[PDB]
Amino acid sequence: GVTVFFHAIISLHFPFNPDLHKVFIRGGEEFGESKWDSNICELHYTRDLGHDRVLVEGIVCISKKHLDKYIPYKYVIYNGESFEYEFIYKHQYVNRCLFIKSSLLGSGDWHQYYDIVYMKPGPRKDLVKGKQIAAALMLDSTFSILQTWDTINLNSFFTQFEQFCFVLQQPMIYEGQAQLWTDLQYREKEVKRYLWQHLKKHVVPSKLKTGLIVLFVVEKIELLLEGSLDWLCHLLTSDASSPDEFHRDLSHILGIPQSWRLYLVNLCQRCMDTRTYTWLGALPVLHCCMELAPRHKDAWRQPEDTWAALEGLSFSPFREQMLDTSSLLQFMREKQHLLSIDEPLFRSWFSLLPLSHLVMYMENFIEHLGRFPAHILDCLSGIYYRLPGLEQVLNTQDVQDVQNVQNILEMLLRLLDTYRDKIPEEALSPSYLTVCLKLHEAICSSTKLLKFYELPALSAEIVCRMIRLLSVQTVFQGTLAATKRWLREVFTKNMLTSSGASFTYVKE
């Protein structure tokens, strides 16, 4: 029927030997109609705690009846001096309550972790030590399954970890009837710090699979990768060559029904909120979990988060507040291979950068754009999403930022011209003409000076190249309209100083 594993923590209660003597479970007529008839089960040695401690393990299988109800259970020990009864320092006959959830039992096997052996030879010391010990021992035990690498091991691991966590989140205590912890007023940080360090130590020397298992453990125990989130980002950053290998590795683990997307969005959101840049390498796994929709041809209607493949991430704060972008581009250059194994990543990285560095981004990854010319169009789309900032930038006639916008447009022209013949006909769409129209509009509306004429002209030339690549007359008409508007605003007065000695504007 139902199989129950017992695991009982022994501590300085007595500085004893692995099996100086022996540990037992006794149970009422619920665990089985053997209520106090004998020690229903004895626990045998399989591993030693050392450092003030020992551990025995036992197994008993009793019929399935126990699903969906509470069991009374108690510990008794063999010591050569007596049979002894354990006791819990509870301020108040009493029971212990064990439980077996029907839903977590896929293997039909329940593991009863987190059981303590308290006997008469303060309590916080026992529970902090014991809880660190049990949680660490559960971590290594469950990781022992990953020694075996395929879907059956992965599912068993996640199930057994969920069984332990079911007992850890509600290791019920009884008073009339049993419910969530009161004997502890659950306190974890002292244990959780040790467990974060222990998980880190054990995982650090397939990495991606390790990182994903670590992230699952982290999110289930409500753990945070405390002030060192970057390390997990390293584990999730693939060294693959091209999509087939990366997707092959990921498929086994991610194919398991789990909330990988929520966990990875949380990871990236925290790595942004704490202002680190290694998370950029984990993005491909988030994209593999997201199950994105194709790059619909009318993309500019798409929101940036859905275009950037960052649904659920507040990227704009990270983009704006993060100052050391030079490290961001150095990291992107270091992990340029990731752009080959993930089409959307170019949009995410582009989206995550501030406006100024975008040109250095497009230059730094121009070879990728030559290998993947369709991405050139996403650059236009990205500038569209930047367009509000560029307006705020153009409205202030700062020579540096106007020159930056000019360099952005010159780069876009350089790309569209050099890669005119490589751009696939599939990704091409009239919608991109609209993007360039809007771009032109925003520049012309915002650009108020005559010397800045180069900026409108380049945007207009961009529209030309888009046309030449292919609402078309409409886009042309809007471009011409905006150009005439700009000329009107700039050329506020008549052409010449009609004295014939000068031109009203030298640049007209």
Swiss-Prot record:
<comment type="subunit">
    <text>(Microbial infection) Interacts with M.tuberculosis protein Rv3655c, which impairs caspase-8 activation and suppresses macrophage apoptosis by blocking the extrinsic pathway.</text>
</comment>
<comment type="subunit">
    <text>Monomer. Interacts with UBE2L3/UBCH7; UBE2L3/UBCH7 is the most efficient ubiquitin-conjugating enzyme E2 for the ubiquitin ligase activity. Interacts with UBE2N/UBC13; promoting 'Lys-63'-linked ubiquitination of target proteins.</text>
</comment>
<comment type="function">
    <text>Atypical E3 ubiquitin ligase that can catalyze ubiquitination of both proteins and lipids, and which is involved in various processes, such as lipid metabolism, angiogenesis and cell-autonomous immunity. Acts as a key immune sensor by catalyzing ubiquitination of the lipid A moiety of bacterial lipopolysaccharide (LPS) via its RZ-type zinc-finger: restricts the proliferation of cytosolic bacteria, such as Salmonella, by generating the bacterial ubiquitin coat through the ubiquitination of LPS.</text>
</comment>
<protein>
    <recommendedName>
        <fullName>E3 ubiquitin-protein ligase RNF213</fullName>
    </recommendedName>
</protein>
<comment type="similarity">
    <text>Belongs to the AAA ATPase family.</text>
</comment>
